[PDB]
Amino acid sequence: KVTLPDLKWDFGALEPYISGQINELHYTKHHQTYVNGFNTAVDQFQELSDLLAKEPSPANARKMIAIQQNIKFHGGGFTNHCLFWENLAPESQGGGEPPTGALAKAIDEQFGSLDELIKLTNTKLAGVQGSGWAFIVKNLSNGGKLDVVQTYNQDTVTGPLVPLVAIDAWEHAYYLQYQNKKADYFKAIWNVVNWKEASRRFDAGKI
Amino acid sequence: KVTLPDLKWDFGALEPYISGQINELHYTKHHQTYVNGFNTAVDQFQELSDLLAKEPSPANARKMIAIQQNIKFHGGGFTNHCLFWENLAPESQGGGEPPTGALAKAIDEQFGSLDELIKLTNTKLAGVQGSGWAFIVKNLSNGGKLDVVQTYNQDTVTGPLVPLVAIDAWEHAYYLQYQNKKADYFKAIWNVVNWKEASRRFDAGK
Amino acid sequence: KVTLPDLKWDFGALEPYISGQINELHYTKHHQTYVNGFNTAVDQFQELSDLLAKEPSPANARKMIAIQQNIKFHGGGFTNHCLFWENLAPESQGGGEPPTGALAKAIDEQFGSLDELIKLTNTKLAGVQGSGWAFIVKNLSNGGKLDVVQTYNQDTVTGPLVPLVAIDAWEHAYYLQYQNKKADYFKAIWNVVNWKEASRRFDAGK
Amino acid sequence: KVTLPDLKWDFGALEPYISGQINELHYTKHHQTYVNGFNTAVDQFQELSDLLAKEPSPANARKMIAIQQNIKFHGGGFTNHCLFWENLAPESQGGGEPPTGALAKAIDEQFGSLDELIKLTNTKLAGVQGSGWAFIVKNLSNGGKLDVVQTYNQDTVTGPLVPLVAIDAWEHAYYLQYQNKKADYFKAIWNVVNWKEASRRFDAGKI
Ligand SMILES: [Mn+2]
Ligand SMILES: [Mn+2]
Ligand SMILES: [Mn+2]
Ligand SMILES: [Mn+2]
Ligand code: NA
């Protein structure tokens, strides 16, 4: 049974880059909904699995097929937002300070500088044509190389792709403050990105 | 735990429209693969579910998300092929005979004729740009109306959509016999379509 | 070269159901974005088509493929919003009044009532897990039957699926006013749906 | 107007890894079909594009949206198969011989060995749940790092993702010889992969 995680900061702590009113809605409404949806979907599948064991019909298999969409969507919603809060921090807790160590080294070697990586990421965020996410990732299958990937809806990066920084591009993540001006939001959010958490994820090679 | 279903006919019973060499591989290899994949996926779900209970972390959620794909794909593969075998039959069991009853009436009212419905379906089949299926369906949400829908890969029709006739458009369904000539396969298969089974599905809405 | 269509109503005309603030942003910003993107994409096609003619390489084919996403997305955004404004109207223009004629008959015959069709549509709207649309459509390929279709992002209904009512489920369509309570928005919008335009679309079959 | 490309080898030249029967059908039927489809779709779009100039209506935009699906699919079909033939060669023409130069250096640095890259690719190919492709690519956006990407149907890798080796995982690519044993096909094809063409693409950073 999953639960809304504790936040490391107060709702209004990322102002002026992200408003407290957005954070409160985003966390108490949107994230809680994925929490509830995920627990419900997992419950429903456990129930369908028990039904399939006694009556392994295509009819019942068809029912399982129907709920896995909810497992994926709500599971992703749960996961992506958890990652999101943990890679945000107020300036007082180091938000917006550049990474150090191995991650900083890989960033410079692959993209030239942190500024270029961020510009690439903002291009990707702007390129999400619908709801979705951009993730700075470490790819474990090609020697641990950095990349920036987009996902849609609540799809997430799995397998060898370890998320280092997740940035939410759903309209609910910025609309009350930025309205249509999503590029202003993408630029502003880096001021409160927690690159210490990114570095920790990079070093661990897991989340 | 699912298994391959009983067939109502022998592998060679659909000759010459669908070769026995195809049916044998199709059932004993391809369908068996979805059976095994689905059973594995459901087992793995059960294991991840216990893991999630012990540690409900994003990491473990991530693992669960990863296997949903296989549940969907192999579950669809299992379900779609079960449908397929049940709506195929040799002529000796009524394959290729036109439907009667309420289904026949609905077909004529909506499409003009069975011939016109079949042509529409062959157009949908030819329009699958990849691996996939066409389904003639009854839509329970809009008053029980017939439609033809395409799916890709092992996606299937769910919700208010009741499959009446499933036709496999994956290349493995025809390649040994027809190779690139998929339209020849789409045309030939209607000689062994079991419309009695479609009519039963239509009447039951299940 | 496309442009924003003229609106038949002032930005604040759909209050209280849809905020004038939302309509103004939705039209002057969001719809404009799609107009700009589509014009840009069609210009690029034109340039790449000429390039491909002179040099029909896989390299240039690859470039042509790369712009198709923009054509589809912005083309969809352009088209869907045009449909949307045309099927909305203030109560003073007859918004929210039930359809009549053939459409009204088809709705009663297939769904039982207008309320049942609306209920089904709201279910499809709530079912969009991401950004998207629901369309009440008339299907030209199954004898002209009504159905409700979900799309994601700016995907739209084409070919035999004729849109009668388009409803936007992107968060920018409701968030300033309803925030997370999208179900409240889906319920409210029917008060300003232009069923007269829906009936016109149904009769024209385009 | 695109045309079927010239092949560098005879239909039967890749036996016994891929039969002459397959190559003949694959090239003269399947590839040709995408050639014809792509030419048709581009002509149709040009036609609608000219109409849209005079009638810039939602109706006409809707018609163009329908056609872009065919441009993408047949365009991809044309492109992927052109890449495919160019990265296959008989053993007499160097097929199956390991890459050298910068490409070989990047492979060992990122994957450990060619064999590890090949195994990863075979895992990706087996993971295509439907029709599709695997590509070994050079990613120009992350400092030119190698990766392996899956696509479905005739989707392809565009922009910063430069295809180095394309491997076809559609059933028509192997069924007549391998039937359901696709893993055997994925394993065998490397014996006739042209790594010299892969190296040229890697060096040029384009196709
Ligand atoms: Mn969010
Ligand atoms: Mn099959
Ligand atoms: Mn909109
Ligand atoms: Mn092929
Ligand atoms: Na509100």
Identify the domain containing residue B194 by its residue range. 90-205
The phi and psi torsions of B192 (rounded to 5 degrees) equal -125, 20
Q: A186, A122 in Cβ contact below 8 A?
A: yes
The C-alpha of C163 sits at a distance from chain A's nearest C-alpha, in angstroms, of: 21
Q: Tokens in use for A11?
A: 């709702």
Cα nearest neighbour of D146 on chain A: A142
Name chain B's partners: 3 or more CB pairs within 8 A. A, C, D
Dihedral sign of CA atoms A68, A73, A76, A78 in order: negative
In this structure, is residue A105 part of a structural domain? Answer: yes
Same domain? D54 vs D100:
no
Q: Which of C109, C110, C142 faces B146 most closely, judged by CB atoms?
A: C142
Which DSSP state fits B157? Answer: -
Q: How far apart are CA A14 and CA C132, in angstroms?
A: 30
Convert chain A into a string of H (helix), E (strand) and C (coil): CCCCCCCCCCHHHHCCCCCHHHHHHHHHHHHHHHHHHHHHHHHHHHHHHHHHHHCCCHHHHHHHHHHHHHHHHHHHHHHHHHHHHHCECCHHHCCCCCCCHHHHHHHHHHHCCHHHHHHHHHHHHHCCCCCEEEEEEEEHHHCCEEEEEEEECCCCCCCCEEEEEEEECCHHHCHHHHCCCHHHHHHHHHHHECHHHHHHHHHHCCC
Mark yes or no for CB contact D158/C46 under 8 Å. no
Give the residue from A70, D127, A72 showing the smallest Cα distance to B68: A72
C66 contacts in chain D (CB < 8 Å): 158-159
In this structure, is residue D2 part of a structural domain? Answer: no
Strand order across the C132-139 sheet: C145-152, C132-139, C161-168
Name chain A's partners: 3 or more CB pairs within 8 A. B, C, D
| Strand partners for B74 | none
Q: B79, B73 in Cβ contact below 8 A?
A: no
Give the residue from B124, B126, B118 showing the smallest Cα distance to B182: B126
Name the structure determination technique: X-ray
Same domain? C68 vs C132:
no
Bond preceding residue A98 cis, omega within 30 of 0: no
Dihedral sign of CA atoms B94, B96, B101, B102 in order: positive
Q: How far apart are CA C83 and CA C85, in angstroms?
A: 6
Q: How far apart are CA D35 and CA D19, in angstroms?
A: 23
C172: annotated binding-site residue?
A: yes
- Please give the full DSSP string across D137-176, using - where no structure is assigned: EEEGGGTSEEEEEEEETT----TTEEEEEEEE-SGGGTHH
The C-alpha of B153 sits at a distance from chain D's nearest C-alpha, in angstroms, of: 5
Q: Which of B89, B110, B125 is the last residue of a domain?
A: B89
Place of tokens 């207008």: C114
Q: Number of folded domains in chain A?
A: 2
Give the residue from A194, A163, A207 showing the smallest Cα distance to A99: A194
Same domain? D162 vs D78:
no
Give the residue from D159, D155, D44, D37 showing the smallest Cα distance to C49: D44
Same domain? D102 vs D203:
yes
| Strand partners for A148 | A136
The C-alpha of A68 sits at a distance from chain B's nearest C-alpha, in angstroms, of: 6
Q: Which of C110, C139, C148 faces B147 most closely, judged by CB atoms?
A: C139
Q: Tokens in use for B105?
A: 């009436």
Q: How far apart are CA C133 and CA C13, in angstroms?
A: 22
C153: helix, strand or coil: coil
The C-alpha of A129 sits at a distance from chain C's nearest C-alpha, in angstroms, of: 7
In this structure, is residue B103 part of a structural domain? Answer: yes
Query: C156 to each of A129, A131, C36, how far by Cα in Å?
Result: 14, 16, 18
CATH of the domain at C129: 3.55.40.20
Cβ density class C77-105: b for 16+ within 10 Å, e for less? bbbbbbbbbbbbbbeeeebbeebeeebbe
Convert B56-81 into a string of H (helix), E (strand) and C (coil): CCHHHHHHHHHHHHHHHHHHHHHHHH
Q: How far apart are CA B5 and CA B80, in angstroms?
A: 12
Q: How far is the CA of A173 from the centre of ligand 1 (A)?
A: 5
Q: How far apart are CA D86 and CA D9, in angstroms?
A: 10
Contacts with D197 (C-beta within 8 Å, 6 or more apart), sequence order:
D86, D87, D89
Place of tokens 């079927």: D4
Q: D45, D68 in Cβ contact below 8 A?
A: yes
Q: Tokens in use for D203?
A: 């060096």
Q: A161, A206 in Cβ contact below 8 A?
A: no
Which DSSP state fits B88? Answer: B
Same domain? C120 vs C27:
no
Q: How far apart are CA D16 and CA D96, in angstroms?
A: 13
Calculate the CA dihedral of residues C18, C24, C28, C34 and round it to 10 degrees.
Answer: -10
Q: B84, A88 in Cβ contact below 8 A?
A: no
Please return the burial class of A140, using the count of CB atoms within 10 Å of its CB with bins 0-12, 13-18 and 19+.
middle
Q: How far apart are CA B182 and CA C57, in angstroms?
A: 28
Calculate the CA dihedral of residues D5, D10, D15, D19 and round it to 10 degrees.
Answer: 60
Q: How far is the CA of B130 from the centre of ligand 4 (A)?
A: 11
Mark yes or no for CB contact C109/B142 under 8 Å. no
In this structure, is residue B146 part of a structural domain? Answer: yes
C50: annotated binding-site residue?
A: no
Q: C154, C73 in Cβ contact below 8 A?
A: yes
How many Å from the N-terminal Cα to the C-terminal Cα in chain A? 18
Q: Which residues of A make CB contacts under 8 Å with D?
A: 109-111, 120, 139, 141-143, 145-148
Query: C60 to each of B82, B193, D31, D141, D206, how far by Cα in Å?
Result: 44, 45, 17, 20, 11
In this structure, is residue D60 part of a structural domain? Answer: yes
Bond preceding residue A16 cis, omega within 30 of 0: yes
In this structure, is residue C3 part of a structural domain? Answer: no
Give the residue from D70, D77, D76 showing the smallest Cα distance to D42: D70
Give the residue from A4, A6, A3, A205 showing the smallest Cα distance to A106: A205
Helices within chain D (DSSP H only): 20-25, 32-54, 58-86, 101-111, 114-126, 175-178, 182-189, 195-204
In this structure, is residue D13 part of a structural domain? Answer: no
Q: B170, B132 in Cβ contact below 8 A?
A: yes
Cα nearest neighbour of A161 on chain D: D147
Q: Tokens in use for A171?
A: 């309209």
Which ligand is located closest to the Cα atom of residue B174? 2
Same domain? D40 vs D70:
yes
Q: Which of A45, A62, A75 faces B61 most closely, judged by CB atoms?
A: A75
C contact test, residue of B142, B146, B149 with most C CBs within 10 A: B142
Q: How far apart are CA B131 and CA D153, in angstroms?
A: 8
Same domain? D190 vs D134:
yes
Same domain? B82 vs B130:
no
Contacts with B6 (C-beta within 8 Å, 6 or more apart), sequence order:
none
Same domain? C121 vs C188:
yes
B31: helix, strand or coil: helix
Q: How far apart are CA A204 and CA B59, in angstroms?
A: 12
Mark yes or no for CB contact B142/C111 under 8 Å. yes
Same domain? C69 vs C100:
no
Mark yes or no for CB contact A132/C130 under 8 Å. yes
Q: How far apart are CA D34 and CA D78, in angstroms?
A: 5
Give, for B45, the enclosing helix (H) or strand (E). Answer: helix B32-54
> What radius of gyration do chain C's Cα atoms show?
18
Tell me how far the alpha carbon of residue A130 is from its chain's centroid.
16
The phi and psi torsions of C145 (rounded to 5 degrees) equal -80, 140
Please return the burial class of B140, using the count of CB atoms within 10 Å of its CB with bins 0-12, 13-18 and 19+.
middle
A155: annotated binding-site residue?
A: no
In this structure, is residue A2 part of a structural domain? Answer: no
D3: helix, strand or coil: coil
Mark yes or no for CB contact A25/C180 under 8 Å. yes
A109 contacts in chain D (CB < 8 Å): 143
CATH of the domain at C57: 1.10.287.990
Q: Which of B47, B63, B89 is the last residue of a domain?
A: B89
- Please give the full DSSP string across B93-141, using - where no structure is assigned: GTTTPPP-HHHHHHHHHHHSSHHHHHHHHHHHHHT--SSEEEEEEEEGG
Q: Tokens in use for A32?
A: 């809680």
Give the residue from A170, A8, A176 showing the smallest Cα distance to A88: A8
Same domain? A96 vs A170:
yes
Q: Which of C45, C70, C89 is the last residue of a domain?
A: C89
Contacts with B22 (C-beta within 8 Å, 6 or more apart), sequence order:
B172, B173, B174, B176, B177
Strand order across the D161-168 sheet: D145-152, D132-139, D161-168
Resolution to one decimal, Å: 1.9
Q: B65, A158 in Cβ contact below 8 A?
A: yes
B143 contacts in chain C (CB < 8 Å): 109-111, 145
Query: C172 to each of A157, A185, C76, how far by Cα in Å?
Result: 26, 15, 16
Q: How far apart are CA C69 and CA A129, in angstroms?
A: 9
Q: Tokens in use for A198?
A: 């990114």
Please return the burial class of C156, using the count of CB atoms within 10 Å of its CB with bins 0-12, 13-18 and 19+.
buried
Query: C93 to each of B161, C9, C86, D126, how far by Cα in Å?
Result: 37, 9, 12, 59
D81: annotated binding-site residue?
A: yes
Same domain? A138 vs A42:
no
- Measured from the Cβ of residue C203, the count of other Cβ atoms closer than 10 Å reads 12
B120 contacts in chain C (CB < 8 Å): 141
Which amino acid, B48? L
Contacts with A148 (C-beta within 8 Å, 6 or more apart), sequence order:
A117, A120, A121, A124, A134, A135, A136, A137, D141, D142
Which DSSP state fits C96? Answer: T
Q: How far is the CA of B173 from the centre of ligand 2 (A)?
A: 5
Q: How far apart are CA C137 and CA C206, in angstroms?
A: 10
Q: How far apart are CA C131 and CA C189, in angstroms?
A: 17
C179 contacts in chain A (CB < 8 Å): 25, 29, 172, 176
Which DSSP state fits C109? Answer: H
B175 contacts in chain D (CB < 8 Å): 171-172, 175-176
Q: How far is the CA of D198 from the centre of ligand 5 (A)?
A: 57
